[PDB]
Enzyme design. Structure first.
Site, PDB file in Angstrom:
ATOM      1  N   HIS B 115       0.811  -1.210   0.000  1.00  0.00           N
ATOM      2  CA  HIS B 115       0.000   0.000   0.000  1.00  0.00           C
ATOM      3  C   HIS B 115       0.855   1.275   0.000  1.00  0.00           C
ATOM      4  CE1 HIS B 115      -3.138   2.738   0.764  1.00  0.00           C
ATOM      5  NE2 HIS B 115      -3.248   2.613   2.075  1.00  0.00           N
ATOM      6  N   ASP B 132      -4.256   9.398   2.329  1.00  0.00           N
ATOM      7  CA  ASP B 132      -4.571   8.074   1.781  1.00  0.00           C
ATOM      8  C   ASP B 132      -5.786   8.122   0.858  1.00  0.00           C
ATOM      9  OD1 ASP B 132      -5.001   5.337   1.200  1.00  0.00           O
ATOM     10  OD2 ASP B 132      -6.024   4.983   3.103  1.00  0.00           O
ATOM     11  N   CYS B 184      -3.038   3.585  -6.200  1.00  0.00           N
ATOM     12  CA  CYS B 184      -2.584   4.257  -4.984  1.00  0.00           C
ATOM     13  C   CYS B 184      -1.301   5.057  -5.237  1.00  0.00           C
ATOM     14  CB  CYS B 184      -2.398   3.254  -3.847  1.00  0.00           C
ATOM     15  SG  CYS B 184      -1.283   1.897  -4.246  1.00  0.00           S
TER      16      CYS B 184
END
Lengths: 79, 225
Positions: B115, B132, B184
């Site tokens: 991540h 995030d 991401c």
């Protein structure tokens, strides 16, 4: 010139000591760190104080000194 | 505001994506090395490997040197977690030859297991703020960086950091959300892009496949349209 000692610390907390003459390319060491202490090479990355170390590079060229430490990390991927 | 994706580009792009020599050298400078393998991570919905981000975080930074723009120092990716895991002593050190404080923004790219995420020290806004895309909060990260600042201050400028008035927090449903499974590291980069340009954020998803292709040329040529 005279030889110097270099610590290579894995992010598993494993220091591996090394002796080399200061004008030598780090290829000799990098590949030895993989061969001995089995590990990939095209999956890790070396850094001296965050400065990305390249194979071309040499201790003197990185202003390295005796008993200085090199950090090595896993390549890291993320979604 | 959009730069076009001109023919000249598309043709060099599609070329570097085609299955070829994966170890081909491709692009240098920044003491970084960008291969067809590294490039490949920008194709389709691939997970962006560290090398790309670091490279982007250098250009983001290199640009923040031009007039009318907040100066920025960006740390490499491994910084954050090496701090989180090993503590300060470990990274003393990585900031010899930078007065971290003589800058407007700090860029902290974070790797959390599987991540990507970003944290931003805005010395002038006086708030460490974490980003995030999937919307997950990491208040810890902020509390850690603040500790860094305190510690760094003692180690570089031999005096305690003036913690007074500072905010620490994380963004929620207030910005653009991930909206897939792999964009991401993408969000992270382009997140920083708007930040570094003092510009607001504006983009959402469909802007990503574009930004993806666009990033590639941006990388090879070092230049951020």
């Amino acid at each position: 010139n005279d030889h110097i000692n270099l610590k290579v610390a894995g992010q598993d907390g494993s220091v591996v000591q090394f002796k080399i003459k200061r004008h030598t390319p780090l290829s000799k060491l990098m590949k030895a760190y993989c061969e001995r202490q089995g590990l990939s090479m095209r999956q890790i990355r070396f850094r001296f104080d965050g400065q990305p170390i390249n194979e071309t590079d040499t201790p003197a060229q990185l202003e390295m000194e005796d008993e200085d430490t090199i950090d090595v990390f896993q390549q890291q991927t993320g979604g | 505001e959009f730069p076009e994706i001109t023919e000249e580009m598309e043709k060099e792009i599609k070329n570097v994506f085609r299955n070829g020599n994966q170890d081909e050298v491709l692009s240098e400078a920044f003491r970084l090395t960008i291969t067809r393998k590294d490039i490949q991570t920008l194709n389709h919905l691939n997970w962006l490997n560290d090398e790309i981000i670091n490279f982007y975080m250098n250009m983001l930074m290199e640009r923040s040197k031009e007039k009318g723009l907040p100066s920025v120092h960006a740390f490499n990716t491994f910084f954050f977690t090496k701090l989180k895991t090993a503590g300060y002593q470990a990274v003393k050190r990585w900031t010899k030859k930078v007065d971290v404080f003589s800058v407007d923004i700090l860029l902290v790219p974070i790797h959390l297991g599987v991540h990507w995420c970003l944290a931003v020290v805005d010395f002038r806004k006086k708030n460490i703020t974490y980003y995030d895309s999937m919307g997950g909060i990491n208040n810890e990260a902020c509390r850690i960086l603040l500790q860094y600042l305190k510690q760094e201050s003692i180690d570089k400028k031999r005096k305690e950091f003036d913690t007074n008035g500072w905010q620490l927090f994380s963004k929620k449903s207030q910005i653009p959300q991930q909206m897939n499974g792999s964009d991401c590291g993408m969000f992270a980069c382009k997140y920083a892009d708007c930040i570094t340009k003092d510009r607001p954020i504006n983009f959402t998803q469909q802007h990503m496949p574009y930004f993806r292709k666009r990033m590639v040329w941006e990388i090879l040529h070092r230049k951020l349209l």
